[PDB]
Design an enzyme around this catalytic site. Structure first.
Site, PDB file in Angstrom:
ATOM      1  N   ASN A   1       5.749  -9.729   6.158  1.00  0.00           N
ATOM      2  CA  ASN A   1       4.649  -8.906   6.659  1.00  0.00           C
ATOM      3  C   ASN A   1       4.563  -9.114   8.184  1.00  0.00           C
ATOM      4  O   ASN A   1       4.252 -10.216   8.659  1.00  0.00           O
ATOM      5  CB  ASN A   1       3.366  -9.336   5.941  1.00  0.00           C
ATOM      6  CG  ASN A   1       2.140  -8.524   6.363  1.00  0.00           C
ATOM      7  OD1 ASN A   1       2.237  -7.638   7.197  1.00  0.00           O
ATOM      8  ND2 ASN A   1       0.991  -8.830   5.765  1.00  0.00           N
TER       9      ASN A   1
ATOM     10  N   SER B   1       0.771  -1.258   0.000  1.00  0.00           N
ATOM     11  CA  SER B   1       0.000   0.000   0.000  1.00  0.00           C
ATOM     12  C   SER B   1       0.797   1.300   0.000  1.00  0.00           C
ATOM     13  O   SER B   1       0.230   2.354  -0.224  1.00  0.00           O
ATOM     14  CB  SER B   1      -1.040   0.016   1.127  1.00  0.00           C
ATOM     15  OG  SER B   1      -2.049  -0.923   0.759  1.00  0.00           O
TER      16      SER B   1
ATOM     17  N   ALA C   1       1.671  -3.546   3.112  1.00  0.00           N
ATOM     18  CA  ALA C   1       2.010  -4.958   3.254  1.00  0.00           C
ATOM     19  C   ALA C   1       1.517  -5.686   2.019  1.00  0.00           C
ATOM     20  O   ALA C   1       0.503  -5.301   1.420  1.00  0.00           O
ATOM     21  CB  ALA C   1       1.375  -5.546   4.505  1.00  0.00           C
TER      22      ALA C   1
END
Ligand code: NA
Length: 355
Positions: free
Chosen positions: A337, A61, A312
């Site tokens: 992540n 993102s 992530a």
């Protein structure tokens, strides 16, 4: 690096890697406007290939900040206006329920409850049209913020229509190239694949999977060096010589909406500095449906702000934060992540120490 940076990075990131079992990490600290790079661990665990300054990570993102700036550049070019209805660029969406949904709403997740993801089964333009037509809004436009790939992904796709370029080509020509991001990609060329880290998800070596509107929502791969340059560009937009890009960066960092003590830009999210770190470490707004207050006109970029974005993918975790008034910033890229509070707490500890 400067010793103040050495000590805080060592005391903060080393524990973080151990605590979260991160296989590989790259960090850049921008201090008095200059970048300092740090790398740990492995881009490939099995082959024990170290992370380097040339290692490519998936930004997830954080890619939305590029989308927001590309959109800002388009506005500054006069190609689009944020008040334009979505239906101007996609007439097939014309319907009472698409009444009053503007590019602004798409860019800022305020269209009224567009879904978090574009469905996996959507592959063609026809599929995409049906998805957006069939969608049933939960709220009136410009009333609730619901963070969603299907919202900003559509914005990115529509924002580039008047350019006559594809989303990828627009991004390359209007953003990557002028800013000298020569190792930042939406599609990694085959000869550059040697630099592309594996992501690791529960022990599996993985890369992000193709999906509709992926390029717009979470499509970018980049090195720690290029990401440092991205932060520098965003810290000092006036230093950028391409006027529309300069203006575009400023538009992306404007405050369009407020909820609680948090503000929504185009891609970028912001708070006034100093922040209460609890509210960004344990962020209760970002991933919830929250009522928003419009800010009209949008507040130009405030210098005493914490400006940030987290990202992530299945196998990667990223974070970027900067404070324009202090000429200070941080990028953290990892091929696992790991939870958001640990990232944000680490970034805040470092920047708070250097401010
Ligand atoms: Na519908």
């Amino acid at each position: 690096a400067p010793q103040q940076i050495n000590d805080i990075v060592h005391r903060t990131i080393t524990p973080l890697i151990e605590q979260q079992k991160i296989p590989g990490m790259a960090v850049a600290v921008i201090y008095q406007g200059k970048p300092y790079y740090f790398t740990w661990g492995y881009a490939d665990i099995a082959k024990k290939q170290p992370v380097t300054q040339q290692t490519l990570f998936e930004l997830g993102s954080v890619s939305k900040t590029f989308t927001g700036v590309l959109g800002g550049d388009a506005i500054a070019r006069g190609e689009i206006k944020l008040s334009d209805p979505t239906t101007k660029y996609w007439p097939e969406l014309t319907a009472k329920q698409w009444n009053g949904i503007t590019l602004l709403h798409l860019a800022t997740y305020t269209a009224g409850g567009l879904p978090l993801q574009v469905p996996d089964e959507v592959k063609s333009s026809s599929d995409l049209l049906r998805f957006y037509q069939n969608w049933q809004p939960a709220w009136a436009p410009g009333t609730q913020r619901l963070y969603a790939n299907s919202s900003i992904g559509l914005f990115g796709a529509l924002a580039v229509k008047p350019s006559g370029l594809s989303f990828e080509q627009a991004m390359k020509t209007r953003v990557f190239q002028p800013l000298k991001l020569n190792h930042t990609w939406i599609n990694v060329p085959s000869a550059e694949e040697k630099n592309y880290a594996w992501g690791y998800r529960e022990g599996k070596a993985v890369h992000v999977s193709p999906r509709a509107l992926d390029a717009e929502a979470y499509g970018v791969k980049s090195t720690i060096e290029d990401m440092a340059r991205w932060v520098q560009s965003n810290l000092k937009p006036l230093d950028i010589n391409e006027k529309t890009l300069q203006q575009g960066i400023q538009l992306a960092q404007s405050r369009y909406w407020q909820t609680g003590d948090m503000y929504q830009g185009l891609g970028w999210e912001m708070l006034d500095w100093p922040v209460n770190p609890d509210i960004i470490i344990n962020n209760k707004i970002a991933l919830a449906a929250r009522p928003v207050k419009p800010i009209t006109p949008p507040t130009p970029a405030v210098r005493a702000s914490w400006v940030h974005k987290t990202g992530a993918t299945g196998g990667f975790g990223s974070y970027v934060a900067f404070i324009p008034e202090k000429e200070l910033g941080i990028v953290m890229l990892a091929n696992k992540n790991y939870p958001n509070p640990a990232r944000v707490a680490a970034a805040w500890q470092i920047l708070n120490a250097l401010q």
